[PDB]
Amino acid sequence: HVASVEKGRSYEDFQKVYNAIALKIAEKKCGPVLVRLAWHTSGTWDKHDNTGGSYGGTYRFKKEFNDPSNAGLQNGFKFLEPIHKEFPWISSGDLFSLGGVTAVQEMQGPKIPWRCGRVDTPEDTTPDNGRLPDADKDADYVRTFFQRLNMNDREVVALMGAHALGKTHLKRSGYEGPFGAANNVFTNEFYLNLLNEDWKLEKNDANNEQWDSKSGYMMLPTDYSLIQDPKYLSIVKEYANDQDKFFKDFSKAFEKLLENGITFPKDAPSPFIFKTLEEQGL
Numbered sequence: 001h002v003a004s005v006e007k008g009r010s011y012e013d014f015q016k017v018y019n020a021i022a023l024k025i026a027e028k029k030c031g032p033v034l035v036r037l038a039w040h041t042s043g044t045w046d047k048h049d050n051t052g053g054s055y056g057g058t059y060r061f062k063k064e065f066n067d068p069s070n071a072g073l074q075n076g077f078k079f080l081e082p083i084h085k086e087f088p089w090i091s092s093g094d095l096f097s098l099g100g101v102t103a104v105q106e107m108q109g110p111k112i113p114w115r116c117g118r119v120d121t122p123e124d125t126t127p128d129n130g131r132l133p134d135a136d137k138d139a140d141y142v143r144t145f146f147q148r149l150n151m152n153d154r155e156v157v158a159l160m161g162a163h164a165l166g167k168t169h170l171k172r173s174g175y176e177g178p179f180g181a182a183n184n185v186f187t188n189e190f191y192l193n194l195l196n197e198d199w200k201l202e203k204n205d206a207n208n209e210q211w212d213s214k215s216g217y218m219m220l221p222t223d224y225s226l227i228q229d230p231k232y233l234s235i236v237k238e239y240a241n242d243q244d245k246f247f248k249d250f251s252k253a254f255e256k257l258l259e260n261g262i263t264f265p266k267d268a269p270s271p272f273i274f275k276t277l278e279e280q281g282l
């Protein structure tokens with residue numbers, strides 16, 4: 001899949017799209033669902049045959065937006081609709097991925113370089129449901145799962161830190177509760193809370209197991225597996241003790257996730273680094 005720049009567009013065009021998304025996030029407090037949308041639209045990728053991935057923007061098709069794994073992301077899509085209406089020239093893959101970048105940055109997360117040029121592909125290119133991960137599994141599951149995305153242990157642990165941004169909803173996923181204290185702010189608190197809170201393995205009202213802290217947080221079985229495996233645990237401790245290292249590693253892993261499957265020509269533009277609304281005085 002060769003990246004092809006939307007005709008005649010440059011950094012300033014994409015900064016205008018960024019800003020419109022950023023204003024929407026401030027308006028609706030929809031940062032977390034847009035991060036999740038960027039991840040799910042990218043996370044269908046299979047390194048073995050280059051199916052799925054962010055390039056084709058196939059979430060716009062029924063099979064994918066109706067994936068049970070994507071329950072709730074329709075809200076994010078809906079919030080992007082006015083942006084795509086104002087900027088109809090941007091491809092769907094570019095919009096979904098840029099939505100995630102914008103959301104991380106606007107929630108005071110790291111800068112995430114972003115490259116344009118994803119191109120819409122037809123409905124028959126939509127990947128089947130079942131490529132996104134299960135939450136009821138263990139560290140071995142997680143490690144194996146993420147090999148299909150070409151992610152190693154450090155990349156996995158870093159990416160999972162995005163959980164502290166938001167919450168689980170029983171009706172959507174079968175899990176209920178906030179993942180952290182810092183709702184709508186990107187921090188390293190996922191790691192700190194895993195190490196420092198008092199966690200109990202309980203059943204929620206959907207009869208699924210989750211880990212609950214007295215402070216009112218929860219963790220999925222796959223989240224908690226990062227302190228049950230000794231290789232993951234050492235990285236959890238590293239990020240709990242170095243906010244900057246976490247931010248830099250997250251940025252790299254998230255850009256990689258959003259770019260898997262895409263061939264950027266040698267004369268493609270460099271990755272863009274968008275200014276936040278705060279940085280622009282907006």
Ligand code: HEM
Nearest residue numbers: 032035036039133134135159162166167168169172173222
């Ligand atoms: C083993 C991997 C992971 C699994 C099993 C998992 C599963 C889940 C589940 C079940 C939810 C709750 C959905 C809901 O009820 O609304 C969720 C929420 C979330 N996921 Fe993950 N996730 C994984 C990895 C990731 C990664 C890699 C990212 C992005 C870097 C991410 C970002 C988020 C965000 C931001 C939310 C919060 C959504 C909200 O607040 O509405 N997840 N995840």
